[PDB]
Design a protein around this nucleic acid. Sequence first.
RNA 1: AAAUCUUUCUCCUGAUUUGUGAGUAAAAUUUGG
RNA 2: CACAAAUCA
Lengths: 512, 427, 417
Amino acid sequence: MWAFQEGVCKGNLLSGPTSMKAPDSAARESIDRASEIMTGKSYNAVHTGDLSKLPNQGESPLRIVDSDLYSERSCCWVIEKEGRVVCKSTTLTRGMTSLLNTTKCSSPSELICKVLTVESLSEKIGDTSVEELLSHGRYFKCALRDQERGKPKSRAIFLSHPFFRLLSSVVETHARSVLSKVSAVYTATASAEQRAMMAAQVVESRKHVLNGDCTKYNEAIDADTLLKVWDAIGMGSIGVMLAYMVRRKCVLIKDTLVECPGGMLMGMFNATATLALQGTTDRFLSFSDDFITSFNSPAELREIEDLLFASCHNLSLKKSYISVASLEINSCTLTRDGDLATGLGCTAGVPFRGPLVTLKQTAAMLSGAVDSGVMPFHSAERLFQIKQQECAYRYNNPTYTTRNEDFLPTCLGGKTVISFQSLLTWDCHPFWYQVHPDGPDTIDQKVLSVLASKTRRTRLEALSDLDPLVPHRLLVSESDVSKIRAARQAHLKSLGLEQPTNFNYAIYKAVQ
Amino acid sequence: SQFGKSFKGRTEVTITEYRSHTVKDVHRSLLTADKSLRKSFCFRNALNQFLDKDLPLLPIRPKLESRVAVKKSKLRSQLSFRPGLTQEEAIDLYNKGYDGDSVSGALQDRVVNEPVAYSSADNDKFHRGLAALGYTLADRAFDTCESGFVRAIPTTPCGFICCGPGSFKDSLGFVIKIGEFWHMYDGFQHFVAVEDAKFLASKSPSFWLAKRLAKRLNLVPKEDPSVAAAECPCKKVWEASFARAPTALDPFGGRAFCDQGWVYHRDVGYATANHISQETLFQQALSVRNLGPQGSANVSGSIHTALDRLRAAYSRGTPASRSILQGLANLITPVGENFECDLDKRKLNIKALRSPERYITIEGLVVNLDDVVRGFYLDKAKVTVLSRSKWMGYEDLPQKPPNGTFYCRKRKAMLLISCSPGTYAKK
Amino acid sequence: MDSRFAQLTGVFCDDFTYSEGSRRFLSSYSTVERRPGVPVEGDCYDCLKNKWIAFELEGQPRKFPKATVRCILNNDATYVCSEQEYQQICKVQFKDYLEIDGVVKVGHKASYDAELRERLLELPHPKSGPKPRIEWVAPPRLADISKETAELKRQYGFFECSKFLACGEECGLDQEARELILNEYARDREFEFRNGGWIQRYTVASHKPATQKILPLPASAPLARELLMLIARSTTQAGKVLHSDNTSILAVPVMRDSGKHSKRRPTASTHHLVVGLSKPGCEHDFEFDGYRAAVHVMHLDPKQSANIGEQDFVSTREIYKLDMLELPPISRKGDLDRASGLETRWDVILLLECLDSTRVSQAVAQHFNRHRLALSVCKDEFRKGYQLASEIRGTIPLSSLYYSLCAVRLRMTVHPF
RNA sequence: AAAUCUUUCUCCUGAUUUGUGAGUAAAAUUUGG
RNA sequence: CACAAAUCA
Ligand SMILES: Nc1nc2c(ncn2[C@@H]2O[C@H](COP(=O)(O)CP(=O)(O)OP(=O)(O)O)[C@@H](O)[C@H]2O)c(=O)[nH]1
Ligand SMILES: [Mg+2]
Ligand SMILES: [Zn+2]
Ligand SMILES: [Zn+2]
Ligand SMILES: [Zn+2]
């Protein structure tokens, strides 16, 4: 049915594919592709452009954003027990904390300052050394990423050592800064639609448009190219160490370590890879493996191809194409006059995930669609009505509702089929506010969150409800945390108030 | 003694690390959402509790009724400038016992963009999901000349600065930089503030004009009795009459009337209409031609690089082009920061001069300063031939085409008119 | 406010008290000493004089209010401050030379920079590689898609019956007959019976893929929503016959057979053999007590079952119809048949896209969108984007890919672009 | 036996938008027409 | 700032 759409359609209606296959196969294919590229037989991994004009940021103070070094995402923690390397998947927070415990350091900034100011690679920074940190930081753990529409074979993702993440954060932030200072049209932060609008304005002066993509982007970006860019933007020891770890990276597959000297595996250096091209020419409005350059004559197209080749941005012959009446970037297609291309486009369906989550997600999708010219409002109203009927069919059983209140949805025993326009303009019973895209969390989300949290030890003393002015980089000991908690409790008691009352900006502004 | 295990080997850790360690450890199970909600009748009991206890405690939100006529247009970005709690407000809320985390999260002035393809006559801002129906954010105005103030071209001028060339009312104030001080006048109280190392030192920060100036300058209001000014022409300037340039209110909710001088309305908090648009960007630039930095238009990337490109384009060009570039530089440069918006005093940057094309993105609008210099966006349109074959569903080329794709019969080809004067300079 | 001076400030506020016990100097870098709800205007706060104190070096001014007294640390071992008492405290407390660590730049060149650069140089480097020769030609024509479909048919062929796709239509049996047929089919296949439920037992595996062929399209899929709802229900309810308004299925867990101490209860990763009924007339017919029906099985891991169940059929159909062109009739094998084609077969195709957990149809849809938008594409390379047969394995994904290609070809045939 | 290393007892990096922030105990049939 | 949902690479 996606074939017979009059306009543009990505076929996003159904959910992304799922796969329970082990990640060994995809990781092995990626490593083999990188090694083959290193031989210079299929694609190019050697940089040739002139990055001498990039500004030098080497004089900027070394500032680390601590918030980016802690998260619940998985990471590879490496242990050397008896001469053997054991790689385990642990939350990035736990990996960072274990790293800081191994080498005595209050904060990551102190750790990096100590690392940069050692007189030898064997000098101890605690129970470790810079050489050991470099050896351990090159290890990666493979995993499978699925639910990506259009990729029947789930992609391979890689978990990196905390030290690698710590070193890469600095270079990525500075590369983004250099991109802002150098790029003709900044797009490292712009969304897909903003990039599409900027491209539609930029390519207005040329007859042809080249909607292109880069193939084997991670495998074609050698450590040499990254170090070249970093030296262009003046990274010194940090860039050298990061390039050394990248060049010596090992990926743990099943129970064996595989060397992957070529490429950079993950998109940890998307900003640097983009700068590798933006630093050599200003004819491309690109970020990562997505460019929208335009041309007038075949000679300009040949020049564009040469520029792409020289910057290790191998053109994707399978996906890249040339258009004259439209232009597509980041799956957003616009006409040459800027109007959004008619058709469904990136509109996606809402799988059944709850009596009210489904309705809320449908409302959000329909609002996003109607805001643009995807479909007229009455079509969105009809679709919302149909989705409500489907939810009534699916979730109107005794295991989901024992009520008969009239105001309830037909999918929870009621008889109310709310109009989309009525819901959007806050013209519904307060029970329906949660269903609104901008309303509060639905009962289903709260229940699911409670169930997720209710699955499992020993918790640290809480440090919530802090001063909104206290910087988060300040050091707190156990006694300091206890004193802070006692002081806050005493202040609440003196005010005769229980645990701090939650603050909602919307209600406060409304009553202001 | 968990602090001795999670952080073994250390006695002090940052607040970030400690907070990140005490986070709920959610787990992913293969069960579907429906089966999880059915399990132990968890969702059934949750719904019963919500309908018995939580539902009565839900405030009744107001209905939306304001609507305006809208027309399909290009895919634009609605720029919302929703503000956050101010520093003093955050302190007050925290000391009252409110949640620290929620207050801190709300303490952030964020700029958001929403892709919307719908434009009204006054170029307003619409709610999320209701741009098709033209549900504007603005509520119906009580007094007419307030709406005149918020409107670029007032329908009925009351002869005063808010909506016409004239003096000020009792409901209008103005903040103007005199010497090394910022004088705020309202009609009753005249205050003077100074920029003291990231703070805004003033006699009484609670003054509405003082808060507005603090927000405009990105400074924290502070109390400082030892602030005074030598010469105060605020009375004479208040009693005088000024020309009202036709422009929508800046994102801060004020309009420029003189060099480093902005008029504010007590009842109007923030601008509800897109200040910068394709048809008003150049008029806005001309209006602030010689009014110093304004800081009303966010430029993508680095402001220093944008100013360097503007200066490089400023080296050559006719006087009108130089004025337009100076106005754009004033628009993009913030107020009170270490920026040299004045292009005459700006040092020429050869590195930004050698580039073949000078593009700057103002509020998502990509302007080629090289084209502006040679009189393109104001004098003559740019035509590029897309094909020699007529396409279906495209209107004929008018005699004075605006920006867009059209069909031309005299040449028998599809043209894409760009940088048309009929779109930017719509006299 | 710079953390560099934090330690320094700690030395300043060295057990200084005022008002008979209260601490005098409160460090701005200490959380416990910090006064909540007060902005920071200096490195520390003195309650006795109610003054903010900041520390600086020679020619290194700090962003602080003028009211903050600065204890300028001269290059020499001397401390100068506006207030005599603060200068005296600086001279006293700072008895041991506290050299503030200099700010570390991003471009810091460590002592090992040359060694690491040498090590990297001695490591392998890539080779240049070839410059591709790109020829821009018109997008693939109808002949190319026809060749793709013909190649798929030749390589794999077609099945005799629709297999589980046939379950999208009524089997012509009432609830009792369906339950009896399913239970007797399970019993005949020697499925283990435990706790009133069926369990499929396996011992050894051939470790080779199952036969792949294209499923011919049934006439229609009236029970698409019902079948998907049953599949969603069967995620946890396994081993017993699950009924619906017009059809029923049976999800038999597949568990290893140890022989004595064998798995009794399915776990999170136990697979399900979903068994469904359709009209007879294929090799899978099963008869019992005069009730005859074709029994079709499908092996699904938990993720496949969840993904298939969660999909919404009616909403997707309506969204597609919003801006769809007239769908043409198609034959049993997805071929344009104006005389004897059935438009309802398109619904079946949609159902197939729902059953195909690999969703290769999404890849085909993206490539066809590019094809429709494109004006010129790389020669011999853009055409090699529909050849996704190597990305998928199984009867259902193979059929889904084949019918996606058939839909593309039909679009190029009846509604040229 | 099938969508065949599975039926054996975790999913990376970055970005745009939106909503919440001291709310605490096992296991997949119990219970969806 | 942390978590959750949608989309993009
Ligand atoms: N670490 C990740 N990087 C991603 C992810 N998605 C996209 N990317 C980045 O974008 C790059 C392109 O990936 P695509 O999503 O376009 C996958 P595609 O099959 O088109 O890549 P090729 O194998 O190069 O053809 C990829 O190499 C990464 O640098 C993701 O989930 N994780
Ligand atoms: Mg692209
Ligand atoms: Zn007026
Ligand atoms: Zn004055
Ligand atoms: Zn059969």
